[model samples]
Target: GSSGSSGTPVNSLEKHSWYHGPVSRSAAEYLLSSLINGSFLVRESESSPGQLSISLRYEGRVYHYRINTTADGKVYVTAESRFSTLAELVHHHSTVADGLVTTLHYPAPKCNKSGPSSG
Candidate 1:
């Protein structure tokens, strides 16, 4: 259900005129600036490669994020929350990178742990 990327808090979501596309460099820069301004710790940053990982918090929810700009001029952002569904995690992962949804995995109850033997 969680399938979306976060950008600078524009006036409104409908008003996307400011953004040329889904990925916004300006917004990414803004987030970077926030990190540098004691907002969060910088976990990783590749100046030459144009990549970074800044820890941040939103609505009191802490998250680890990575941002990178490809040679094709495409900006990517990926994030992970402590308490989020797997679908949301996958969506966030794919947002900043190319990925495939091969299958969905869930934890099944442990009725019996012993090897499948006589009942």
Candidate 2:
């Protein structure tokens, strides 16, 4: 799979650093595999296009968690406390793992300057 940012952008989620917006699962793996523990990111979901996918690296592997947004717009992962948006969700989880595999300590920034390691 490909592993670089050479495509479009979604402004709604652009302001949030933790949001990857549009990235394949395998592509996400390439981003975090070279980084240290607790580095993470959330990207666009395939099944639930309106929702998001939290991709995190810990212990040298990546763990994914889905963000479920209900009809009322309350977003949560499984039975965890809900938030209105991804920023709020990331904000709370960054401070506390709450129900994640690990805290959102660092974000896998999709900067044009950062190259992929092909791992």
Candidate 3:
């Protein structure tokens, strides 16, 4: 809600700070020089961009978990785990770390996706 742009506008969800979108795995390991054990981000699908993966920084390694979205318009991380929205999926993880080294705590923000200002 700041200023409208002069050039061609892009994808609709650029306003959402929740994802870094298309970055692949080798480059997706985001180490901010601190402990981000439960830090998570929505990733572009390993299967394809049309699909999706939920990536989290745990044990200092990137774990991209593939979610199965059904035609019923439901999203599920696996067979038993299910949700109504992407936010719901993330929210569910907050209560249970499951096998994750750390439970969900942070949603990676795209505000500084490149790097810190000091760089």
Candidate 4:
């Protein structure tokens, strides 16, 4: 179980995000869909504890995401900047020591900033 800084300890196995901690899968999906225009996803992992998986897209880029139970039983969203192993993915993002989750987005190409489809 991992420790978190949300002030509300993750007391269950439900899906959650920084903005909405320890919420139901559907609730999380609803929020993600609104943020990413209905591109939210769910999957099953062969090697992770929570066989269930869910993800969201941002700025037209897809992110692979999962909920991981830390040493102390806290659940946090482990997202990858790109498809990769859990360890590699975690290294790529900035996580707080207390395991407060953070949103990760793909970097914009400098030349595409003012393009017609800017995110």
The residue pairs in collision within model 4 are 1-70, 1-71, 1-72, 1-73, 2-70, 2-72
**Among these predicted structures, which one has the highest lDDT?**
2
Candidate 1 RMSD to the correct structure: 18.4
lDDT, candidate 1, 7-38, per-residue tens: 45334322111111233434444443433222
Greater TM-score among 1 and 3 belongs to 3
TM-score of each: 0.22, 0.72, 0.63, 0.28
Q: Best to worst by lDDT, what's the order? A: 2, 3, 4, 1
- Cα lDDT tens digits for candidate 2, 51-74: 578888888888888777679887
Q: Quote the lDDT for 29 in model 2.
A: 84
lDDT of 2 at 109: 54
**Error of model 4, residue 52, in angstroms:** 3.8
| Segments of candidate 4 deviating more than 4 angstroms | 1-38, 47-49, 78-119
For candidate 1, the 10 contiguous residues with the lowest summed lDDT are 100-109
Scored against the true structure, residue 39 in model 3 reaches a CA lDDT of: 73
Model 4 C-alpha lDDT versus the unseen true structure: 0.40
Rank list by TM-score: 2, 3, 4, 1
